[PDB]
RNA sequence: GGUGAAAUUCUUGGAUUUAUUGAAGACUAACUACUGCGAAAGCAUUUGCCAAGGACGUUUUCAUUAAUCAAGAACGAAAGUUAGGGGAUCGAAGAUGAUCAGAUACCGUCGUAGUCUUAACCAUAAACUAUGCCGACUAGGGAUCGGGUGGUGUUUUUCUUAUGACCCACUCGGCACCUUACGAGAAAUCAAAGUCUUUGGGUUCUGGGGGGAGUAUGGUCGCAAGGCUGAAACUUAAAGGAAUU
């Protein structure tokens, strides 16, 4: 996997995580 | 490692050189990493000149040349044999062959 | 002694034009394109087609009375190509060898003083 | 090798060996002093005066002929300005830049330059305070700076 | 190279070398006795002016400033001090 | 040719047409140019109506004889229809691409100058200039660029010259002046102080705005 | 039209093409270079105004005012974010025609957002010379740009001219380059990446096997996207660099 793609994936994951956190709040 | 001390570009003292598009495939390439071949072709092909002359009103006529500078992205150049792969020892020669 | 017209060859990398007009360039005397003569679609540009077109044009010219032409050679120009198509030279040759008279030949390709953006994107036509 | 740019130049005046007055020069030190005083009265900065001396008259350097530097002489007579010359010049320059900025806002290069100038001024101010040429509280701002200039 | 007398070099070589970079620093500039074509007065003009130096009695402009060495006003005649 | 479109008797239109005669202004040598072809005058919509305004762009060598004028080109606007003859006026001077490009050599600065100016009539002309920097016959330096200040000065001078030369007399007069390249020579003479200079040409004269029509004046350029 | 070949699409209410023109927004070809300038990002049409700046010249002036910097500031490509104006081209998404076993990929045709701008934000790029800044010294060689000197040197010519442009020689400052290293280095290579086991000119920052991970968490800054800061458990004998046949 390209590093850039990995980074992108991570970012995507983090968005979801953020959303989850917001929901929890 | 560095394949080229020039980085294959020719800028150094600059910072950003504006890109020119490729004449073959439009691959946007910096104006220095550009491979510039200036083609002075005659407007009429070498074999078809005589006929033209025969046709022409006013004998002893100029017959002009067409002028254009061509910009090849390096890959394209490589493909089209404008440039060739050279040995490590003779990559260094900056002087044109002719 | 002579009757003059404007030959107006426009040869793109696909499909080629011949277009005889008067000296004013407003009124027309036969167009005839490479796609008219050969119906094989890829052969719109090929020299043979161009030659055929030129021949056709010549006949028309003869019929009208235009003994002589000035040729304006043209590529697609602007953002596109700039290099003349394969069926311009052929067309010219055909014109020459029809008994028709020649003189004053120029490139009229629409060269920009730097233009709008070219088609293809950053990485261009990746084949 | 320069203080705010990448510049590396070495262009400078090179003072001759002999402290003594040049052999060809006549006149008098007193005369020179008088001339200097006159110049000061007229309303010139030390450097300008020095330049004038060099050009119109036979004066190589004032310290070579009189025994004293021009600024010192000015001070002695009671003519040395409220603000030291270089500092004043710097302030003036800064003010011009500020004025320009006031007029046109998007000039980012100009803004950058202004900062540099300000820094330089601050440095100079600090130096002066240490030497106690300026009163030990003297600060540089905007309106105040303008006032000083004008 | 290798062995030199660095203390007293050839005069020509010294001349060639930049002012400052010489053995002891000394100016390349000099002073001039300027005679204006009209009145009989001698003014001592520095060769690298900056200011448009006039005669002390009459306004005539003897020298105009340039990059380095100042230019004399044609009718004027000088003598190196 | 086999592919057909969706597309959602008076054959040979040249039998519906007549030939005319392109008459150039008295400024040139070969005063008649060639043939122009127009439709026959139908009652309301005459032949002379759709003629006055037409531009015929012709080679300057084919008006003067000499082929040292081959690179130059002239636009001629049809104005007065005599009956068979049609009288033109100067519309625009041009350089052919094959000389303009030829003269743009690498390793020397090209100096390009613009100006818009009124004639002694009311003709608004935009006239252009090209000048190149010369390797002065003595040079070892493989370039010969001019400094920017010098270039600017040259441009200014050129502009001044152009202003002097237009504003003073008719468009016909201007054309006359132009044909044996006097203006270029003058420019060269002027600029020998600032920088050597070479291949000085007024390339491109563009007409922008003309006065009324004034038939008499036009006529006075023929006969 | 388009293409490797096609098809999509537009077309006898007349496409394409030809000629004059007009509007709109882009961009600034050729000239354009182992050339310029700027702190970097960056910056090529003309002219004017507005300040700024390096180098040079200087027998001008101040006289240690300096070098580098944790705190703090200023700018900061492109995308992206608000809200206006603009919206020609090109075009993430989308449609959509092919190609393929598949092909919401490359190729083709359209095409919102964006591309341009005005007020804000954002603070990152292979933001690269992957070479921190200031200073000294060591080796030749031509170039070239900026300035300055000396040439009864060439040309210009309006008679001396006087400039200007060249020509030669020297000189500071710059972008580089060529050959040797007697020095370095793992080597590729390097006039610095040299003057280091013959180890100390001054300083700021950063790294300490590979993964986990630029992740988790806590701060903090962002309207948001995100940025700056930044672990550990556990895991592993290699990951890597330059060269070789
Ligand atoms: Mg590799
Ligand atoms: Mg620089
Ligand atoms: Mg960059
Ligand atoms: Mg390929
Ligand atoms: Mg220094
Ligand atoms: Mg500092
Ligand atoms: Mg049509
Ligand atoms: Mg330049
Ligand atoms: Mg341009
Ligand atoms: Mg900090
Ligand atoms: Mg943007
Ligand atoms: Mg898609
Ligand atoms: Mg599909
Ligand atoms: Mg596509
Ligand atoms: Mg970073
Ligand atoms: Mg880095
Ligand atoms: Mg580790
Ligand atoms: Mg390897
Ligand atoms: Zn390409
Ligand atoms: Zn006098």
List the CATH number of the domain containing D117.
1.10.287.10
User: What's the CA–C1' distance between C25 and G20, in Å?
Assistant: 9
What distance in Å separates the CA atoms of residue D104 and residue C36, rounded to the nearest whole number?
63
Structure tokens at D35: 């001339």
Of F67, F70, F101, which has the smallest distance from its Cβ to B67's Cβ?
Answer: F101
| Structural domain that includes position B55 | 1-98
How many domains is chain F built from? 1
Domain count for chain B, please give it. Answer: 1
Residue D7 φ then ψ, to 5°: -50, 145
Question: Is the separation of the CB atoms in B68 and C83 below 8 Å?
Answer: yes
3-state class (DSSP) for residue F192:
coil
Helix (H) or strand (E) run with residue F85 in it? strand F85-95
- List the determination method: cryo-EM
Cβ atoms of D66 and D29 closer than 8 Å: yes
* Interatomic distance A5 CA / G220 C1' (Å): 28
Distance (angstroms) between ligand 17 centre and the Cα of A9 equals: 23
CA of F93 relative to ligand 14 center, distance in Å: 43
Asked if B43 lies within 8 A of C123 by C-beta distance, the reply is: no
Q: Distance between CA atoms of F200 and F110, rounded to whole angstroms?
A: 10
Report the DSSP pairing between strands C68-74 and C101-107: parallel
In three-state form (DSSP H/G/I as H, E/B as E, the rest C), the secondary structure along chain D is CCCCCCCCCCCCCCCCCCCCCCCCCCCCHHHHHHHHHHHHHHCCCHHHHHHHHHHHCCCCCHHHHCCCCHHHHHHHHCCCCCCCHHHHHHHHHHHHHHHHHHHCCCCHHHHHHHHHHHHHHHHHHHHHHHHCCCCCCCCCCCHHHHHHHC
Q: Which residue of C has its CA nearest to F1?
A: C39
Residue D53 lies in a domain: yes
CB-strand contact C122/G, under 7 Å = no
- Based on the fold, state whether residues D46 and D65 are members of the same structural domain: yes
- Min CA distance, E2 vs chain D (Å)? 28
Identify the three-state secondary structure at position E35: strand
- E78 CB below 7 A from strand G atoms: no
Give, in order, the Cα–Cα distances in Å from B69 to each of B84, F33, F145. 20, 36, 21
CA D83 to centroid of ligand 2, rounded, Å: 36
Contacts for E24 with CB less than 8 Å, ≥ 6 apart? D17
Nearest protein residue, CA measured to C1' of G243: B1
| CA–CA separation, B54 and B67 (whole Å) | 25
Q: Are C21 and F52 in contact (CB under 8 A)?
A: no
Strand G closer than 7 Å to the CB of F182?
A: no
Which residues of E1-81 form beta strands (DSSP E)?
Answer: 31-35, 42-46, 63-64, 71-72, 77-80
Distance CA(F38)–CA(C26), nearest Å, equals 9
E46 C-beta neighbours (distance < 10 Å), count: 24
CATH number listed for the domain at residues E1-81: 2.20.25.100
Distances (CA, A) of C127 to C119, C121, C124, F22: 15, 13, 9, 53
Contact C97 B26 (CB under 8 A): no
Strand-pair partners of B42: B65
F182-191 and F171-178 helices, crossing angle to 10°: 70
D5 CA to G204 C1', in Å?
A: 19
List residues, by chain if needed, whose CB lies under 5 Å from ion ligand 19.
Answer: B 22, 24-25, 27, 73, 76
Are the CB atoms for B19 and B28 separated by under 8 Å? yes
Q: Say whether C123 sits in a helix, a strand or coil.
A: coil
Same domain? D76 vs D90? no
Of C2, C73, C83, the CB nearest to B43: C73
Question: Chains C/B: 3 or more C-beta pairs closer than 8 A?
Answer: yes
B79 in reach of chain F (CB within 8 A): no
Give chain A's largest Cα–Cα span: 35
Going by C-alpha positions, the residue among C11, C60, C4, C2 that lies closest to residue C34 is: C11
Residue D68 included in any domain: yes
Give E65's contacts (C-beta < 8 A, 6+ positions apart): E49, E50, E51, E52, E71
Residue A13 CA to ligand 15 centre (angstroms):
22
Nearest to D36 by CA among D100, D86, D80: D80
Reading the block at residue F160, the tokens are 């001044």
Non-local CB neighbours of C3 within 8 Å, separated by 6+ positions: C65, C66, C67, C68, F34, F35
Total domains present in chain C: 1
Residues ≥6 apart with Cβ < 8 Å to C21: C5, C6, C8, C27, C28, C29
E63 assigned ligand-binding residue: no
Q: CB neighbours (10 Å) of residue D121?
A: 17
* Same domain as D102, residue D115: yes
Assess contact for D57 and D26: CB atoms under 8 A: no
**SS3 readout for chain B:** CCCCCCCCCCCCCCCCCCEECCCCCCCCEECCCCCEEEEEEECCCCCCHHHHHHHECCCCCCCCEEEEEEECCHHHHHHCCCCCCCCCCCCCCCCCCC
Burial class (CB in 10 A: 0-12, 13-18, 19+), F157: middle
With H, G, I as helix, E, B as strand and everything else as coil, classify residue C47.
helix
User: CA B32, CA B17: separation in Å to the nearest integer?
Assistant: 7
**In angstroms, what is the resolution?**
3.5
How many distinct helices (H) and strands (E) make up chain A?
1, 0
Tokens 């995580």 — which residue? A17
The answer to whether B73 touches C124, Cβ cutoff 8 Å, is: yes
Q: Among C27, C35, C70, whose Cβ lies nearest the Cβ of F37?
A: C27
Short-list F72, F76, F100, F83, CA closest to F207: F76
Structure tokens at F142: 């493989």
Q: Cβ of D98: how many Cβ atoms within 10 Å?
A: 18
Which tokens belong to D45? 């900065």
Give, as one character, the DSSP assignment of residue C28.
B
F166 with F207: CB under 8 angstroms?
A: no
**In a domain? residue D8:** no
D62 plus D112 within the same structural domain: no
CA to C1' distance (Å), from F112 to G46 = 9
Q: Which of C118, C42, C58, C45 is nearest to C82 (CA)?
A: C118
- C-alpha closest to that of F28 among F93, F80, F81: F93
Provide φ and ψ at D137, rounded to 5°.
Answer: 180, -15
Beta pairing partners, C74: C10
E10 is in an annotated binding site: no
What sign for the dihedral angle of Cα D111, D117, D123, D126? negative
- Residue whose C-alpha is closest to residue E65's, from B93, F202, D55: D55
- What would the two tokens of residue D32 be? 């020179």
Domain boundaries, chain E: 1-81
Q: C24: Cβ under 7 Å from strand G?
A: yes
Q: What distance in Å separates the CA atoms of residue C54 and residue A20, rounded to the nearest whole number?
A: 73
Q: Which domain holds residue C54?
A: 1-127
Strand partners, F55: F77
Tokens 């608004």 correspond to F124
Residue F106 to residue F133: CA distance in whole angstroms: 11
User: What residue numbers bound the domain in which D72 lies?
Assistant: 26-80
């Amino acid at each position: 996997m390209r590093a850039k793609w990995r980074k992108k994936r991570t970012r995507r994951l983090k968005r979801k995580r953020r959303k989850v956190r917001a929901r929890s709040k | 490692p560095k394949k080229r001390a020039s980085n294959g570009r020719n800028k150094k003292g600059r910072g950003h050189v504006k890109p020119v598009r490729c004449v073959n495939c439009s691959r946007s390439v910096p104006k220095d990493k550009a491979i510039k071949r200036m083609a002075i072709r005659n407007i009429v092909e070498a074999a078809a000149i005589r006929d033209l002359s025969e046709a022409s009103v006013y004998a002893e006529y100029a017959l002009p040349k067409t002028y254009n500078k061509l910009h090849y992205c390096i890959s394209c150049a490589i493909h089209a044999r404008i440039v060739r792969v050279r040995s490590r020892t003779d990559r260094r020669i900056r002087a044109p062959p002719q | 002694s002579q009757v003059f017209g404007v030959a107006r060859i426009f040869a793109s990398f696909n499909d080629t034009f011949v277009h005889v007009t008067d000296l004013s360039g407003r009124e027309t005397i036969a167009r005839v394109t490479g796609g008219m003569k050969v119906k094989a679609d890829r052969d719109e540009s090929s020299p043979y087609a161009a030659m055929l077109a030129a021949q056709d044009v010549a006949a028309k010219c003869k019929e009208v009375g235009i003994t002589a032409v000035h040729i304006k050679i043209r590529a697609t120009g602007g953002t596109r190509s700039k290099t003349p198509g394969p069926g311009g030279q052929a067309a010219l040759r055909a014109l020459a060898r029809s008994g028709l008279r020649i003189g004053r030949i120029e490139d009229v390709t629409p060269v920009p003083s730097d233009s709008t953006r070219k088609k293809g994107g950053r990485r261009g036509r990746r084949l | 090798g320069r203080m705010h740019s990448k510049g590396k130049g070495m262009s400078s005046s090179a003072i001759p060996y002999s402290r003594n007055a040049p052999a060809w020069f006549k006149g008098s030190s007193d005369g020179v002093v008088e001339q200097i005083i006159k110049y000061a009265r007229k309303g010139l900065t030390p450097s300008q005066i020095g330049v004038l001396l060099r050009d119109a008259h036979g004066v190589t350097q004032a310290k070579v002929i009189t025994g004293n530097k021009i600024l010192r002489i000015l001070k002695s007579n009671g003519l040395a300005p409220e603000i030291p010359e270089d500092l004043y010049f710097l302030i003036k320059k800064a003010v011009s830049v500020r004025k320009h900025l006031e007029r046109n806002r998007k000039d980012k290069d100009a803004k950058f330059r202004l900062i540099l100038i300000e820094s330089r001024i601050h440095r100079l101010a600090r130096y002066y305070r240490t030497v106690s040429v300026l009163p030990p509280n003297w600060k540089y701002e905007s309106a105040t700076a303008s006032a000083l200039v004008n | 190279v290798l062995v030199q007398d660095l203390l007293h070099p050839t005069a020509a070589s010294e001349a060639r070398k930049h002012k400052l970079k010489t053995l002891v620093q000394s100016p390349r500039s000099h002073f001039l006795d300027v005679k204006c074509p009209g009145c009989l007065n001698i003014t001592t003009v520095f060769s690298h002016a900056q200011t448009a130096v006039t005669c002390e009695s009459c306004s005539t402009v003897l020298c105009t400033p340039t990059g380095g060495k100042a230019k004399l006003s044609e009718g004027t005649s000088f003598r190196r001090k | 040719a086999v592919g057909k479109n969706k597309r959602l008797r008076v054959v040979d239109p040249f039998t519906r047409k007549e030939w005319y005669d392109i008459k150039a202004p008295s400024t040139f040598e070969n005063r008649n140019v060639g043939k122009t072809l127009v439709n026959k005058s139908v009652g309301l919509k005459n032949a002379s109506d759709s003629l006055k305004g037409r531009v015929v762009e012709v080679c300057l060598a084919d008006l003067q004889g000499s082929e040292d004028h081959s690179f130059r080109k002239v636009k001629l606007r049809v104005d007065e229809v005599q009956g068979k003859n049609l009288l033109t006026n100067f519309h625009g001077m041009d350089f052919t691409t094959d000389k303009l490009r030829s003269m743009v050599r690498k390793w020397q600065t090209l100096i390009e100058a613009n100006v818009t100016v009124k004639t002694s009539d009311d003709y608004v002309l935009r006239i252009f200039a090209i000048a190149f920097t010369r390797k002065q016959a003595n040079q070892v330096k493989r370039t010969s660029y001019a400094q920017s200040s010098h270039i600017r000065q040259i441009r200014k001078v050129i502009s001044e010259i152009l202003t002097r030369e237009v504003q003073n007399s008719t468009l016909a007069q201007l054309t006359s002046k132009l044909i044996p390249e006097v203006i270029n020579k003058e420019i060269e003479n002027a600029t020998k102080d600032i920088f050597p200079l070479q291949n000085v040409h007024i390339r491109k004269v563009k007409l922008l705005k003309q006065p009324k029509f004034d038939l008499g004046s036009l006529l006075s350029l023929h006969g």
